[PDB]
């Protein structure tokens, strides 16, 4: 059986083989004997020259049509000859040559990768395939450098090589969230064949995470008001920042379980906001001070709660006037009671503090009594010069006891005091 | 004109406060002559002043927590006073805390949830204790079961107020353990002050659950990289080819797998299987052709349903059984149209040969003429074989013979195939 090779893409009338020759058949008896190509092994590849015995090329051979990617590739043609009968098989093999690049199934390829994917994590892909066998067949891929994905491609065996991405270092949707490379491809081409290349767009869609907390600029704020602040008055308005998508970066605040249930009282948070405002008395006297915790979440799976202060001072204002107590006062008063004698005794007290719980007091009227002090907030009402009336007659002392605050407060109070007779 | 007493709180009726009279320099039988008396303003019903002596006496008992509350300062302001002359005198009694009170806790029962991917380090607050004494007799410190996943930070804010959170010291796994349960307690400062009976020091408890919640933290997960499954070729649709298990000890829908083709496969393959989304089943939906091909390679991947899903992979090889499907093909060469009547033995009149698509004995081709005729058959080669003339031929001048050749496969069942041509004698000078 005889054995000849041809080249795909050659041109009509392209040698093949001498059949006569390699047979040892002489051209004289050809026609005599009948050469001729049996009736089963037509092809429309071959002629056969019967008084010569050469095989020629006729219609183009396209190896990739009538073999595909089979790794081999046969013509079977059959001669024989009469009187005797003798049969030849003669096998025409078909080399494969490197004129298809590889191609890749999608021109575009879009592939999604959480962040929170693990370094050297792999990412199948879609091989590229070309039509040609063998060293022209596909070869390796390579992808744009970078820091994020190298490939890996893999034989095993059956001529296939198959590629997926690996992940270098992890992503950060929060930086960047897509990233986009050139995959490409090429076989082993290298009379001489050159290398062919293909060519495909890479898009990486970096899916989100909830990786990201809430995040306050400090942990404590200190905020300054005034007692008596009205309800509603803007304490602060806090702002947790979250990067992350979706319900992974959207915060609610809430107060944290340290805060004391007189605060809960005081004070309203608006979940979705974070606005801390005054909801109800704020009284210097009661506190000068309040610690308010807040806790800010994302709405997302996983979340981690953060945590600030708020320290809350209040400032004192003159919301309370002076208080008198009267302890004693002396039912009457000898006429002839000398410069000096105590009439009464009482005390003066303000809530506030500083300048606003300061009292200073006054006796009023063109009358003979003066106003000492013995003790701290304790107060004697004396005798100054004789007296204008005598007997009978009674004085009625009111004194004005006022704070030292903006406005200032103050109070008033009376007493009856009488002269009798001298025991 | 101003005096100073202490009295602790709790004690009983007519204790000893203090002795007025001796400490102002009055003598006693001058008090009823002077009008002593306390001032109208400053009674209060937690003091009994004996007239006739000068001695303050305790009368109501004290409860400091419910006058003074948790002021660290508590004092009771009496006044008294004479007359002929009048004199007022100032009296300040001072209340100390004992340590009566234990810490509390609002509720028994904390409840906390906590992410498994939390990191080590992060704080939880607590609900704090509250203990209504004042000083060293209030809330001193926390103290929580010794485990190696929490401590305890206390952090002290001045004005009597402490505040305790949990600190995560190490990853919490929910799919090892998904609650700890805890003891936590609360201990004041009475162990060691103004010449009170030493104080024991009181404490208070509640219990402590912690939740884990679940992360998508777990990938599902192959027993193996790569499956081989051997089938018969032509298994019908439907046939299994292997039933895959994902493991996800995940909840929920971080649990929940799903599988599918993975991107690799061969379209070939993708046309030949089908795989079940949910429970993993692979089976055949084509005809399986051995000799088409082998071998098949079905690259899979399987992924849960929560976010963050991390993709597994795996891979089946189905390693394809030959069947005799295919009966043997018969191809004549060349035929002799005529054979003379006077052949001599061994004339050759045909050749052709044999092909089975199958392989091994199923591709095993023997070959048989058929009838009681003057003719045999020859095998230069292998499949290939020539019809000779044997002996002399029965017929003569016009008639042709006609033969048939059986060719027969070795497979089981067995498979043959026939073709016959007629070839007509001649005659010869
Ligand atoms: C809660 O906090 C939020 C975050 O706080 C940030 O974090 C800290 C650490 C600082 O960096 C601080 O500066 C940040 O604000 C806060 O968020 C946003 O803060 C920005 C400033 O960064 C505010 O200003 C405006 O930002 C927008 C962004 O628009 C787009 O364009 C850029 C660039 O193309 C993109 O990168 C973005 O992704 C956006 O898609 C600007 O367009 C805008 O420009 C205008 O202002 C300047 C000022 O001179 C003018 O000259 C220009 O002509 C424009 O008129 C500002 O730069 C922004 O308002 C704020 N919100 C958002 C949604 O960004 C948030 O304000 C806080 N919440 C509350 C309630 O306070
Ligand atoms: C994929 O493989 C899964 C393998 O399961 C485990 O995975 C790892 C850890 C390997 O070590 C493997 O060996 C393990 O078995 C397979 O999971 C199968 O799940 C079922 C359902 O739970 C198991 O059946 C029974 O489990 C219970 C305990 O489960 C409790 O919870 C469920 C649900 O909440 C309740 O329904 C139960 O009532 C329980 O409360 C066992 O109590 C029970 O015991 C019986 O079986 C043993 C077998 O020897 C007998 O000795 C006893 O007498 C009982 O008759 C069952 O075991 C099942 O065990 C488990 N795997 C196997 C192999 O049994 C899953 O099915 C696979 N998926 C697919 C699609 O194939
Ligand atoms: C295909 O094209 C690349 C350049 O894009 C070459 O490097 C390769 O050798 C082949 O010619
Ligand atoms: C596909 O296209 C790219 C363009 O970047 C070439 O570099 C490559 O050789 C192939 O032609
Ligand atoms: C209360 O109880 C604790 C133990 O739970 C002690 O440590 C403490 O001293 C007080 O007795
Ligand atoms: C609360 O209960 C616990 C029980 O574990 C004690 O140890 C503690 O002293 C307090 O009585
Ligand atoms: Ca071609
Ligand atoms: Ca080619
Ligand atoms: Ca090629
Ligand atoms: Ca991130
Ligand atoms: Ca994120
Ligand atoms: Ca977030
Ligand atoms: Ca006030
Ligand atoms: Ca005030
Ligand atoms: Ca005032
Ligand atoms: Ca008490
Ligand atoms: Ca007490
Ligand atoms: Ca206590
Ligand atoms: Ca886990
Ligand atoms: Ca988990
Ligand atoms: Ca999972
Ligand atoms: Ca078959
Ligand atoms: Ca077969
Ligand atoms: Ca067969």
Request: some cysteine.
């Given at each position: 059986?005889?054995?000849?090779?041809?080249?795909?893409?050659?041109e009509?009338?392209?040698?093949?083989?001498?059949?006569?020759?390699?047979?040892?058949?002489?051209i004289?008896?050809?026609?005599?004997?009948?050469?001729?190509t049996?009736?089963?092994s037509?092809?429309?590849?071959?002629?056969?020259?019967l008084?010569?015995?050469?095989?020629?090329?006729?219609?183009?051979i396209?190896?990739?049509?009538?073999?595909?990617q089979?790794?081999?590739?046969?013509?079977?043609?059959?001669?024989?000859?009469?009187?005797?009968?003798?049969?030849?098989?003669?096998?025409?093999?078909?080399?494969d040559?490197?004129?298809?690049?590889?191609?890749f199934?999608?021109?575009?390829?879009?592939?999604?990768?959480?962040?929170?994917?693990?370094?050297?994590?792999?990412?199948?892909?879609?091989?590229?395939?070309?039509?040609?066998?063998?060293?022209?067949?596909?070869?390796?891929?390579?992808?744009?450098?970078?820091?994020?994905?190298?490939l890996?491609?893999?034989?095993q065996?059956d001529?296939?090589?198959?590629?997926?991405?690996?992940?270098?270092?992890?992503?950060?949707?929060?930086?960047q969230?897509?990233?986009?490379?050139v995959?490409?491809?090429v076989?082993?081409?290298?009379?001489?064949?050159?290398?062919?290349?293909?060519?495909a767009?890479?898009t990486i869609?970096?899916?989100?995470?909830?990786?990201?907390?809430?995040?306050?600029?400090?942990?404590?704020?200190?905020?300054?008001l005034?007692?008596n602040?009205?309800?509603?008055?803007?304490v602060?308005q806090?702002?947790?920042?979250?990067?992350?998508?979706?319900?992974?970066?959207?915060?609610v605040?809430?107060?944290?379980?340290?805060?004391?249930?007189?605060?809960?009282?005081?004070?309203?948070?608006?979940?979705?906001?974070?606005?801390?405002?005054?909801?109800?008395?704020?009284?210097?006297?009661?506190?000068?001070?309040?610690?308010?915790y807040?806790?800010?979440?994302?709405?997302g799976?996983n979340?981690?709660?953060?945590?600030?202060?708020?320290?809350?001072?209040?400032?004192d204002?003159?919301d309370?006037?002076?208080?008198?107590?009267?302890?004693?006062?002396?039912?009457?008063?000898?006429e002839?009671?000398?410069?000096?004698?105590?009439?009464?005794?009482?005390?003066?007290?303000?809530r506030?503090?500083?300048?606003?719980?300061?009292v200073?007091?006054?006796?009023l009227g063109?009358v003979?009594?003066?106003?000492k002090?013995?003790?701290?907030?304790?107060?004697?009402?004396?005798?100054?010069?004789?007296?204008?009336?005598?007997?009978?007659?009674?004085?009625?002392?009111?004194?004005?006891?006022?704070?030292?605050?903006?406005?200032?407060?103050?109070?008033?109070?009376?007493?009856?005091?009488?002269?009798?007779?001298?025991?």
């Amino acid at each position: 059986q005889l054995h000849y090779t041809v080249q795909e893409e050659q041109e009509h009338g392209t040698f093949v083989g001498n059949i006569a020759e390699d047979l040892g058949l002489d051209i004289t008896k050809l026609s005599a004997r009948g050469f001729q190509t049996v009736p089963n092994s037509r092809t429309p590849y071959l002629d056969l020259n019967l008084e010569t015995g050469v095989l020629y090329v006729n219609e183009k051979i396209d190896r990739e049509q009538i073999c595909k990617q089979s790794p081999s590739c046969v013509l079977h043609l059959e001669v024989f000859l009469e009187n005797p009968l003798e049969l030849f098989q003669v096998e025409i093999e078909v080399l494969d040559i490197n004129d298809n690049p590889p191609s890749f199934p999608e021109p575009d390829l879009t592939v999604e990768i959480s962040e929170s994917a693990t370094p050297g994590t792999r990412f199948p892909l879609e091989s590229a395939f070309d039509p040609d066998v063998g060293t022209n067949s596909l070869r390796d891929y390579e992808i744009t450098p970078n820091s994020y994905f190298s490939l890996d491609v893999q034989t095993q065996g059956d001529g296939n090589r198959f590629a997926e991405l690996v992940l270098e270092k992890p992503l950060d949707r929060e930086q960047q969230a897509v990233h986009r490379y050139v995959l490409t491809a090429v076989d082993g081409g290298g009379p001489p064949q050159q290398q062919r290349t293909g060519t495909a767009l890479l898009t990486i869609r970096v899916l989100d995470s909830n990786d990201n907390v809430p995040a306050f600029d400090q942990p404590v704020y200190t905020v300054s008001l005034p007692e008596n602040s009205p309800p509603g008055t803007l304490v602060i308005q806090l702002n947790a920042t979250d990067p992350d998508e979706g319900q992974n970066g959207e915060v609610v605040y809430s107060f944290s379980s340290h805060i004391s249930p007189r605060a809960r009282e005081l004070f309203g948070l608006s979940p979705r906001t974070g606005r801390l405002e005054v909801s109800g008395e704020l009284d210097y006297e009661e506190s000068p001070v309040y610690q308010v915790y807040v806790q800010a979440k994302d709405l997302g799976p996983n979340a981690v709660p953060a945590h600030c202060k708020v320290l809350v001072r209040v400032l004192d204002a003159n919301d309370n006037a002076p208080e008198i107590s009267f302890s004693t006062v002396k039912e009457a008063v000898s006429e002839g009671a000398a410069p000096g004698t105590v009439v009464a005794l009482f005390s003066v007290t303000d809530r506030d503090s500083e300048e606003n719980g300061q009292v200073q007091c006054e006796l009023l009227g063109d009358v003979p009594f003066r106003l000492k002090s013995s003790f701290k907030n304790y107060y004697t009402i004396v005798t100054e010069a004789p007296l204008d009336r005598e007997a009978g007659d009674s004085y009625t002392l009111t004194v004005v006891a006022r704070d030292r605050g903006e406005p200032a407060l103050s109070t008033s109070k009376s007493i009856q005091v009488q002269v009798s007779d001298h025991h």
